[PDB]
Amino acid sequence: PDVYLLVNARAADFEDRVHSLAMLVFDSNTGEKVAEHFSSSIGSGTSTYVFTVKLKPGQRDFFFVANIPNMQTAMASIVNKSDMNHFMQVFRDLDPIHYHNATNNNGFPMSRMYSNQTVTIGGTITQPLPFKPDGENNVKLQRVVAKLDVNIVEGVENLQKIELCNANVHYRLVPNQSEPIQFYGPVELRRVGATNQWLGYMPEAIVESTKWWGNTGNAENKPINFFRLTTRGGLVYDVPIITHEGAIPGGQYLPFAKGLLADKPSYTVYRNRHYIYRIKTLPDKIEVKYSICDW
Numbered sequence: 001p002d003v004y005l006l007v008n009a010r011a012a013d014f015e016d017r018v019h020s021l022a023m024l025v026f027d028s029n030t031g032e033k034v035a036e037h038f039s040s041s042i043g044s045g046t047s048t049y050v051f052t053v054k055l056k057p058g059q060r061d062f063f064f065v066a067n068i069p070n071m072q073t074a075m076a077s078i079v080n081k082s083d084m085n086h087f088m089q090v091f092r093d094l095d096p097i098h099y100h101n102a103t104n105n106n107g108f109p110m111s112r113m114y115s116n117q118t119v120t121i122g123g124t125i126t127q128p129l130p131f132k133p134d135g136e137n138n139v140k141l142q143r144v145v146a147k148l149d150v151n152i153v154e155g156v157e158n159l160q161k162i163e164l165c166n167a168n169v170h171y172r173l174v175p176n177q178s179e180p181i182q183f184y185g186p187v188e189l190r191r192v193g194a195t196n197q198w199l200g201y202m203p204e205a206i207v208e209s210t211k212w213w214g215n216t217g218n219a220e221n222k223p224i225n226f227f228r229l230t231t232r233g234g235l236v237y238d239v240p241i242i243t244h245e246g247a248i249p250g251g252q253y254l255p256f257a258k259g260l261l262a263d264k265p266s267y268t269v270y271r272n273r274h275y276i277y278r279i280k281t282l283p284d285k286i287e288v289k290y291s292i293c294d295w
Contacts, residue, residue, distance in 0.1 A: 003057050004123035005131045007037070009064060009139035010048040011110060012272060012295070014102035017045035018110065018141065021064065022071045024084055028059035028116045031081035035060075038072045045104065052128045057121045062133065063088065065173060066110040066141050088113065091170040091181070094203050098145065099167060099187045101199070108201070110141035111173040142272040144171035145201040147295055148241070149274060150189060150227060152196040155281030162189040163228045164200045165238075166220065168269075171203040175271070179206050180223045189227070200227075207267035212259030213240045224267045229279070229286065237286050241275055243268055244292065253288045 011018055018041070025035040035055035063084055065071055078084050088111070095106065102108050114133040123129035133139055150162055169182040189198040207216075207223050216224060225241040240257040242265035248256050249263045257265055269275070274295045280287040 001057070001121050002123075003055055003119055003121055004125055004128035005053050005055065005119070006050065006123075006128040007053060007131045007139060008048070008050045008137070009141060011066075012112075012140035012142050013045075013047065014104060015108065015143075015147070015295075016047045017041075017102065017104075017107045018047055018049065018066045019045060019105070019107045020068070020071055021049050021066045021141075022068070022075055023053070024063045024065075024075060024078060025053075025055060026061045026063075026081035026084060028061050033078070033080060033084075034058075036075055038075065040072075043105075045107075052125060054125070055119070057119050060117050060119050062114045062117060062131075062139075064110075064112045064139055064141060067107040068109055068173075088173040091172055093169055094145070094171050094184070099164070099184065099201055100190050101201070109144045109171060109173065111144065112139060112141050113174065114139075143295065144173065144271050145203055146269050146271060147274045148189070148200045148202065148227065149276045150198040151276070151278050152198075153278050153280055156196045158231045158233070158281045158283075160230045160232045160234075162198050162230075163187060164189060164202060164225065165228055166205075166222050166225050167202040168205040168223070168225075169203075176204050176206045179208060183222055186228075202269060204271040205269040207269075209264070209266060211267070212264040213257065213267075214259055225269050227277075229281070231281065239277065239286075239288055240265075240267065241269060242266060242290075243270055243273070244290075248290070253290045254286075257290075 021039040023037040039049045164187040167184040168180040189200045229237040276291045278289040
């Protein structure tokens with residue numbers, strides 16, 4: 001007795017485009033592949049896919065992978081759930097252009113997985129049952145990168161350039177449990193037109209919480225991500241990137257971020273989060289305000 005499922009998927013506008021989407025479904029217990037589907041947009045670029053799939057009922061693990069080169073071919077070498085999990089765990093080198101931007105034809109890798117979903121009997125090919133992953137209405141894809149958003153609220157006349165340093169070389173389609181093994185060279189951020197906003201992107205990067213700025217065991221402070229501001233005077237400022245919700249201990253971002261206080265930050269950069277800096281460039285110093293939010 002079958003199930004017809006209506007799958008609605010979307011990213012959680014080059015940053016939002018989903019050019020291809022693979023769905024692979026496995027029996028949660030046996031690991032058998034029980035359904036798969038591939039979608040692509042000839043163009044110009046959609047952010048959502050809606051489609052119907054037929055499968056047998058039971059307990060199912062759903063895997064969604066977007067914007068992976070030749071994912072359709074890859075699906076044939078994913079025979080069972082064990083293969084599928086290995087595939088999700090691969091360290092993949094981020095396309096060089098993606099530290100700067102997604103493009104019209106090359107979107108950010110995205111994924112999502114939902115385990116042990118109860119798929120019940122029913123639906124028809126014309127009237128399918130809506131797929132409700134973990135009770136939600138939509139499949140919500142997570143980008144594998146974070147967005148770095150640097151805004152010069154004052155003193156942009158003094159700015160020569162901004163670079164993202166120690167970015168992870170690799171992304172992973174499921175969250176990282178270990179620090180990066182390899183690091184990308186410096187990325188000069190891209191100015192949004194003639195505004196005072198600079199952008200870049202980088203893969204998720206785990207940093208052990210036993211480390212802090214100036215105490216990583218590494219002269220370059222790897223694996224801590226930071227951005228470097230260079231002024232026309234040739235002054236340089238390094239701003240470590242952290243993940244911190246709520247009020248900053250001591251009220252000043254830089255001393256906290258630089259590991260100068262008893263409380264140390266988390267330096268992990270998480271996928272699909274938005275790191276926003278508001279910077280004032282004064283003659284002899286900078287001031288930095290910070291927030292982290294969803295993308």
